[PDB]
Symmetry: D2
Subunit: 334 residues, 4 copies
Amino acid sequence: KLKVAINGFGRIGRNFLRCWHGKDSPLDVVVINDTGGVKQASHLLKYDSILGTFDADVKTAGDSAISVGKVIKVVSDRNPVNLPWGDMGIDLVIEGTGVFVDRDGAGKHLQAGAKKVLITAPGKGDIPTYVVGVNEEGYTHADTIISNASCTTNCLAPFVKVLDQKFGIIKGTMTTTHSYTGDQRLLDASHRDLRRARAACLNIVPTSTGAAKAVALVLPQLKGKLNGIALRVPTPNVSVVDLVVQVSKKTFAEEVNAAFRESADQELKGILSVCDEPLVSIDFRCTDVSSTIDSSLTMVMGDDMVKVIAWYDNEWGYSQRVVDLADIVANKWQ
Amino acid sequence: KLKVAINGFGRIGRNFLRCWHGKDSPLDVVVINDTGGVKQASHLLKYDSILGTFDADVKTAGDSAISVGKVIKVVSDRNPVNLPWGDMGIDLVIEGTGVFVDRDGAGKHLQAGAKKVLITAPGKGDIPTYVVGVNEEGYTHADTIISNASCTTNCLAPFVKVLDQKFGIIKGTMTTTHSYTGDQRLLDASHRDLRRARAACLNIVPTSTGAAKAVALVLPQLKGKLNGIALRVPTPNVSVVDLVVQVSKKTFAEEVNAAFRESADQELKGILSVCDEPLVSIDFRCTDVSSTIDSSLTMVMGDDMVKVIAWYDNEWGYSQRVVDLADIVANKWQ
Amino acid sequence: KLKVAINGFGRIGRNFLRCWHGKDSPLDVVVINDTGGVKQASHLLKYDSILGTFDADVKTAGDSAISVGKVIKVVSDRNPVNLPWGDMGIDLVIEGTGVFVDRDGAGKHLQAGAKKVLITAPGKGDIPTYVVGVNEEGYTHADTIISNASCTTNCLAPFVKVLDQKFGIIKGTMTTTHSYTGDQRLLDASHRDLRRARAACLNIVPTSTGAAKAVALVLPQLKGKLNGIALRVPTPNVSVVDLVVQVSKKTFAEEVNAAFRESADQELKGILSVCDEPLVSIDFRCTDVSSTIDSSLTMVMGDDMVKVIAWYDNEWGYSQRVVDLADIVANKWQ
Amino acid sequence: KLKVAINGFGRIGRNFLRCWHGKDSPLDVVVINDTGGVKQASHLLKYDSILGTFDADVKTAGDSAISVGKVIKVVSDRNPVNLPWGDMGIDLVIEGTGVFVDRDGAGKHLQAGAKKVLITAPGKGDIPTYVVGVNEEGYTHADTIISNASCTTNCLAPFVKVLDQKFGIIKGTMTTTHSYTGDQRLLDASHRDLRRARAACLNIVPTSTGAAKAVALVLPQLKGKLNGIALRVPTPNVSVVDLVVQVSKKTFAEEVNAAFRESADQELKGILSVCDEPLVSIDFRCTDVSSTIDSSLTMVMGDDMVKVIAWYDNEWGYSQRVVDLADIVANKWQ
Ligand SMILES: *O[C@@H]1[C@H](O)[C@@H](COP(=O)(O)OP(=O)(O)OC[C@H]2O[C@@H](n3cnc4c(N)ncnc43)[C@H](OP(=O)(O)O)[C@@H]2O)O[C@H]1N1C=CCC(C(N)=O)=C1
Ligand SMILES: *O[C@@H]1[C@H](O)[C@@H](COP(=O)(O)OP(=O)(O)OC[C@H]2O[C@@H](n3cnc4c(N)ncnc43)[C@H](OP(=O)(O)O)[C@@H]2O)O[C@H]1N1C=CCC(C(N)=O)=C1
Ligand SMILES: NC(=O)C1=CN([C@@H]2O[C@H](COP(=O)(O)OP(=O)(O)OC[C@H]3O[C@@H](n4cnc5c(N)ncnc54)[C@H](OP(=O)(O)O)[C@@H]3O)[C@@H](O)[C@H]2O)C=CC1
Ligand SMILES: NC(=O)C1=CN([C@@H]2O[C@H](COP(=O)(O)OP(=O)(O)OC[C@H]3O[C@@H](n4cnc5c(N)ncnc54)[C@H](OP(=O)(O)O)[C@@H]3O)[C@@H](O)[C@H]2O)C=CC1
């Protein structure tokens, strides 16, 4: 119902497409800018080493893909401005290329005729960034460019918000043991980040995370109260956040968990979740929630220091939110 | 000079042997109880997917291995009591089989004629446990059974001790992102631990760690001040400890680091170390220190909450300490 | 309709259970001998790092598992003879423990009261071994113990049979690049096979394969015409067979492929398959056929030397056949 | 003694540098064109997830690296022509960038002032390609551009040559189970090769190999007698070639092996080798020979069909040859 165009048909680009494919009554993905090609587009959409073979009749239309029924125009141009958004009448552009995350760069879409742009990552500075289930209500239809934050910020914010509300977060540090991603090197090669420059499947790669300071955007009350690092490890998808926060009200794990289970059943039903099962990474693959609290691990040391371990499917979960946020955009005029 | 016998020729058993091989003027490894066989013993000692091919003339003596020069008797019997310790006159038994870690079980060696037993892990209860560079001086030659703690406890204790001395640890939680180990399953199989039961190279496996409470043994002042969890990840060796502790004296990362660098150059020269290099796992393989602080990551949030990230080669580093502790045993009579 | 009992609830044991769960109108799995426990049984059946979370209401019945509806008695005893087969009235025992593959060992089930025993592997000598789609018709209901061959023999036989029929296999060698399996070591440890003794996820492990000589059992005409090796590589499931055979009638790849496609649509519809898609391992996960020919790779060098590359999901595909063979057992009398 | 410049400081670029570092009395590497930077250059040269930390005092000279002693000018420009070869007086350019493999592209170095260019791969058509230990003697100092073939062609040629000489290769097919390389994707992304486009550490990736037809270049007698495919698997370095060839003279494995051992000790001492040890991948890391025959696996089926399995360290072994070939260039005139 809302004309959507996907710029960047990579991990999230393709996940997004598959995430709503199934969604019940969304917007309308009508175009795809895959630097690759029509061939590459349908092949990589039908086959996924992580998502599995796409259960859908994904074919080629001579010059655009076609899923069980629909034809999606496929275009290729790495210069956003030369894109048909205007001519086709694109309303929303899911900017998942990871190169146009600043007002300027993302603005290229706008000038190609696109109406809004939804950056599938952290916006660069002057950009409104929302996390569904935390601050999505502050969204204005007058927002020309949006940021759906990072995968880590989406997993972290929700239970943080709950933690702050019910116990009063004084300050804390989080560490994310995160799967490797396209940004890393398969084998020791050139990367701005000399740590990321190292073979991804062979090492545990320390690296900076913004998610900590990013939580403050979606939850102003935590401004300057958090910070952390990321540890990239030998797994394709599904990551885990390890949050240690010193709170205001004395507490115990069981109590913290219960708090998560209210919110999980209430204001975050669909965003936050609480698992009491002895699961591991894989078990969380293809989960639609932004964050799943691993109850069995919650620890409160010293009546004020709370440790929380939450899981997240950085690809699918996040793509689900991108779909969600887009839906909102749709519900708020254009 | 001190007759040593290795019970359990596995990862640490073989690492230990190779660790002192090179040591300059030790004790004397004269026997090896490898449930396997003479063949298996020299082959797995010469070839190591993690340590690399052993740079030494490792052969077979018909019924015992032989390294560049020496002949080590090889025996096989999973019932410690039926071992020749007595007859051969074994003084110290490096108990690295991981099954005899309680006073009773480890005691089997004693009754086979062995004098002392050095458990290559956490002792089970009634066992003196020492960490070189922390409490090794409390060692008594009247100690019939010793525990060299866990790999994680050895990496953690040293910088914790420093942290406590210089800033006063009030309480904290540590999380160890640790390589997989023989205890885990290659593919989903039976394990007491349903999380460890899952494929090791495919998931991030949450699991209980004792190291937290264990620090209290070697550093009494931290009794009941710590606790944490372990996260097993897809890497063969080299792990990392993520310690978050709330201290007494306000501080800043640079200051914490400096503190580590005094100790590193003083009382812990050889145990603790501080790296300012943007390294990753692999880079720490084959390091002789128990713990290397990753300076670039030290974070102090809220003037009292300190986050420390230290690396450790769970196989080699620990084996080095086992060699060290054995040497001590040697220096204290028998 | 046919009382089935699963001895050994491991990779195939669990796959088998899940393979028929879905089958349309089979036999009846009423018991499971899982050395583990009821807990371990349902947990490892519900969660699978390779198969994915089981889409079924898998619970615990106090002392037996329960799937979306059904209750399956769970028993534990590693001594087949002490099993209730008799008392419960077990007709068929899916021997997937991998330890009772000889007439004697497998015979234990019989003497516990079980009627037939279907070894989920290669039988040890004096055992009828059948491969569905090749020699299953030679099955006699008077067969007290069956062997469903290896996973590799099931992938190889079908297209070999076709190759022999249409071109006349003179002699050849096959090489299977196979995923690692429970039989291998996670890290350098003791194994009868010093190559398998090496870390599975770190090396390419050459190992002996019987599949070559095994084809001769199910296809007598190939007796002494084949032989090969196996190369275990860093992947959980899905393997590939590389068969090079010198034939009688001169040919060309496209012709060989057509031959496979002919049979694929006829006598082997459901056993053999031919993919023209540029797929890779993962893409073949959860395929019900015993063998999928990778058309794009077929090569005929010298008008008589034919190279074939076929894929197989060693866990699922094979389990599907085990279900199939059991069904047969069910159709020919009791 | 011969002014050498390295264009492309990647896997081979860095391996080459380290390969001769140790060589005894070579040529003289005086410059490095690393699109990266001086920083990146020394860091990635000192640290290697595969090669290990470089045992050498590798520092920064403000604007060029410096190894234990020496200063190597470091330059960055992806347009070969704008390189100082002329001004510095570069004699040989080790073209290891993998983008200038055709006469035209590689010719850019020449026109920047470089004398010869040694492509670290397969040359594109009109280029003399030599394999040390096979056809290096046909080298002319009037050769303006050289190709040191592929890593696979270097492993294959030597034992093929021997096979041809002693038994008469009629025709055959080879399959190489090769480690992943920079050319593959860490995660499903865009690649010309839709198979290589798939996650490297997750799948077994079939891919086309030239090595088969390439052998014909260095061994004219095999023109049109060979062909094969490659199967990229989840390992960083060290690959294996599986050659099946039908010969002229009837033979047996032990005889074939002896033939290899004969040459291994003679004309190929240093190029070919024969291992009787039950080793696996890792064990062959850092081997200086182009090819190591795995004796234990040699198979002769049908008195004429010979199967050979040889190992090769695609990074180090090949780099050793590149050093070797360069040395030759150095010995035949300028
Ligand atoms: O943080 C990331 C980032 O902001 C973004 C993309 O991440 P992804 O994980 O999908 O990575 P990728 O697989 O490399 O996808 C990037 C694609 O962009 C295409 N591309 C680059 N430049 C263009 C231009 N100019 N025009 C069209 N397409 C373009 C690339 O194509 P090529 O491969 O041909 O270079 C890639 O296809 O999403 C963020 N992210 C957020 C949450 C979760 C998450 C994850 N992977 O877990 C990533
Ligand atoms: O926490 C561990 C544990 O306490 C111990 C051993 O750990 P390791 O990592 O070496 O494991 P492994 O490779 O499985 O070695 C165990 C060997 O014991 C042999 N064995 C078992 N039972 C016997 C008996 N009864 N008699 C003789 N030998 C025996 C096993 O042989 P098999 O494989 O034939 O079963 C194994 O060979 O060390 C601790 N540890 C501490 C620090 C660091 C560390 C690491 N790996 O990082 C482990
Ligand atoms: N994996 C695959 O790809 C295929 C395997 N096979 C064959 O199937 C067999 C098993 O292989 P797989 O499932 O892969 O391996 P697993 O080790 O995963 O399964 C073997 C099971 O046997 C169980 N077990 C052992 N002894 C007993 C006993 N005495 N009583 C009850 N349970 C017992 C083991 O329990 P525990 O773990 O408690 O020791 C384990 O669960 C082998 O014959 C194998 O060659 C055939 C085709 C495919
Ligand atoms: N790896 C192996 O096993 C073997 C590889 N080879 C061959 O060697 C070549 C390179 O392979 P490999 O080292 O493996 O791969 P890498 O990608 O690791 O190396 C290629 C290098 O070329 C650099 N580069 C690209 N363009 C330029 C340029 N125009 N100017 C300066 N530097 C440039 C790249 O820099 P950047 O990363 O900044 O883009 C990269 O560092 C290929 O021909 C390959 O087939 C041969 C034998 C073995």
